[PDB]
Amino acid sequence: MISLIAALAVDRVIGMENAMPWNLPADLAWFKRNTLNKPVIMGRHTWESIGRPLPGRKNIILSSQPGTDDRVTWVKSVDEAIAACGDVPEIMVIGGGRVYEQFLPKAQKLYLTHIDAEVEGDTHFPDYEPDDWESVFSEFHDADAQNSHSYCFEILERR
Ligand SMILES: NC(=O)c1ccc[n+]([C@@H]2O[C@H](COP(=O)([O-])OP(=O)(O)OC[C@H]3O[C@@H](n4cnc5c(N)ncnc54)[C@H](OP(=O)(O)O)[C@@H]3O)[C@@H](O)[C@H]2O)c1
Ligand SMILES: Nc1nc(=O)c2nc(CNc3ccc(C(=O)N[C@@H](CCC(=O)O)C(=O)O)cc3)cnc2[nH]1
Ligand SMILES: [Mn+2]
Ligand SMILES: [Mn+2]
Numbered sequence: 001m002i003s004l005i006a007a008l009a010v011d012r013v014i015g016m017e018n019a020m021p022w023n024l025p026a027d028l029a030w031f032k033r034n035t036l037n038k039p040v041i042m043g044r045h046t047w048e049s050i051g052r053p054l055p056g057r058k059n060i061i062l063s064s065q066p067g068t069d070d071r072v073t074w075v076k077s078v079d080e081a082i083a084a085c086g087d088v089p090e091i092m093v094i095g096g097g098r099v100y101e102q103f104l105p106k107a108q109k110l111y112l113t114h115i116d117a118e119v120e121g122d123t124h125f126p127d128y129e130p131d132d133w134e135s136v137f138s139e140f141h142d143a144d145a146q147n148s149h150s151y152c153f154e155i156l157e158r159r
């Protein structure tokens with residue numbers, strides 16, 4: 001099973017200048033809980049944005065060019081990325097925009113954080129057809145001293 005996980009600001013913005021400009025520790029904790037001990041697939045730009053391997057996860061990087069770091073696994077196509085995960089129950093696709101576009105048609109589950117924040121981004125999450133997805137979990141949180149915007153955790157499953 002393939003799942004996507006992403007945090008979206010207003011208008012489905014997910015990034016700006018290869019960075020995420022907000023800071024929501026509660027959302028990073030949610031990301032860690034939902035990805036630990038699973039393989040994670042990311043594109044090369046997201047690999048450079050994160051800047052180091054994510055511990056406790058098999059890190060698989062999509063790039064058309066040879067890998068430059070043997071602490072992670074480099075693959076050259078979507079099919080190779082999936083095969084490199086092996087026989088696991090759940091593969092987590094962690095972006096970015098181009099990678100989400102390619103894996104969305106194959107995904108059965110979306111783990112989305114909706115952040116109540118406006119930022120002027122250059123990368124968006126794909127337009128997804130709402131009729132195809134059932135919300136199976138949602139949890140709203142007001143802003144607090146650690147998390148400067150309100151946010152909603154949602155899990156959607158393909159109908
Ligand atoms: N808010 C969130 O949840 C979230 C999550 C992840 C990322 N982001 C943000 O998203 C942005 C990065 O997204 P992005 O769309 O620019 O880039 P991306 O999807 O991370 O990376 C794209 C790169 O991945 C490689 N790639 C993708 N598909 C491939 C394929 N089928 N075969 C081979 N290589 C493939 C290519 O690398 P080569 O050029 O080397 O071939 C391509 O240029 C950043 O701003 C980051 O902060 C946000
Ligand atoms: N909901 C969500 N939030 C995100 O921040 C996010 N980020 C990415 C890609 N970028 C990043 C950037 C940093 C870390 C990171 O530092 N993660 C640590 C934090 C652990 C914690 O804060 O408790 C990790 O071990 O996962 C992960 C992914 C993909 N999907 C996401 N999905
Ligand atoms: Mn092929
Ligand atoms: Mn198999």
Ligand SMILES: [Mn+2]
Binds near residue numbers: 116117118148150
């Ligand atoms: Mn806000």
